């Protein structure tokens, strides 16, 4: 969200290889497993009682894919995150009441999932670009609380 045109190119090239359902379902499940208070927003998803209930709930995978597809949209509009997520910014503040800190936890869990899936291709420099993207997204969702 202030990247070189080559960093941006590296970011987009990795996103060509992101399976949004596999990565999204895993990122959301790990969030719910690792930061347990995040489960209170997803009462309606049913059994979220242990890591296996969580990683296998079809409701988690489908919501993870929706969250990730939306993230993929901010990746394709890095020069305009603020407007890409305004409406999403009001849903989370107004209707969901999610603390903005959770946007940062999810962004980092996403980064850990990309590392797990891409291994050594997910170099330190590529990770640094992605930290700017997840922070760019976390601040545009957090833009309507401010």
């Amino acid at each position: 969200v202030q990247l070189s045109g080559e960093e941006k190119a590296a970011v987009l090239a990795l996103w060509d290889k992101v399976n949004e359902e596999e990565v999204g379902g895993e990122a959301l499940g790990r969030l719910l497993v690792v930061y347990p208070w995040t489960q209170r927003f997803f009462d309606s998803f049913g059994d979220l009682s242990n890591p296996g209930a969580v990683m296998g709930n079809p409701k988690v995978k489908a919501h993870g894919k929706k969250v990730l597809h939306s993230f993929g949209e901010g990746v394709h509009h890095l020069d305009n995150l603020k407007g890409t997520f305004a409406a999403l910014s009001e849903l989370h503040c107004d209707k969901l009441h999610v603390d903005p800190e959770n946007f940062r936890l999810l962004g980092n869990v996403l980064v850990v999932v990309l590392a797990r899936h891409f291994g050594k291709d997910f170099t330190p420099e590529l990770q640094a670009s992605y930290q700017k993207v997840v922070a760019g997204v976390a601040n545009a969702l957090a833009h309507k609380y401010h």
């Binding site: 980092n108 980064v111 850990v112």
Partner: protein, 141 residues
């Protein structure tokens, strides 16, 4: 918190890290210096280039201290007592920075042990790095 199940996951996971602890500690610093450049501020006297011998040497010290903590989960405050003084009194390391390094170390472990880095193991390792971070900033507040 470090429950027995968390202690069992952390010991098992660190046995898989085995002899790469220092090389993983060096890679984690590197990802931290590139992803969160304000951190570079505590290391003026280092050559921070990719492959600097200093970073590699410091990656080994950090890796050994984590391997010591894993051996004393029941008493991190006494095992890391000497490191609390250094980080709090001598270096005045901003506590936010332990979080960035913890994140970078989890990222590095996800890169190298993808099959062992399961959701339950990721959760126990996060609690562990959080406990270690608390002991190191204890001498502050």
């Amino acid at each position: 918190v470090l429950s027995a199940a968390d202690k069992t996951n952390v010991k098992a996971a660190w046995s898989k890290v085995g002899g790469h602890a220092g090389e993983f500690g060096a890679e984690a610093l590197e990802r931290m210096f590139l992803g969160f450049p304000t951190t570079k501020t505590y290391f003026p006297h280092f050559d921070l280039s990719h492959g600097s011998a200093q970073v590699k040497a410091h990656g080994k010290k950090v890796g050994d201290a984590l391997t010591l903590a894993v051996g004393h989960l029941d008493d991190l405050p006494g095992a890391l007592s000497d490191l609390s003084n250094l980080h709090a009194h001598k270096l005045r390391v901003d506590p936010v920075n332990f979080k960035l390094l913890s994140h970078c170390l989890l990222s590095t472990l996800a890169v190298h042990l993808p099959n062992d880095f399961t959701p339950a193991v990721h959760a126990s390792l996060d609690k562990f790095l959080s406990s270690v971070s608390t002991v190191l900033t204890s001498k502050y507040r």
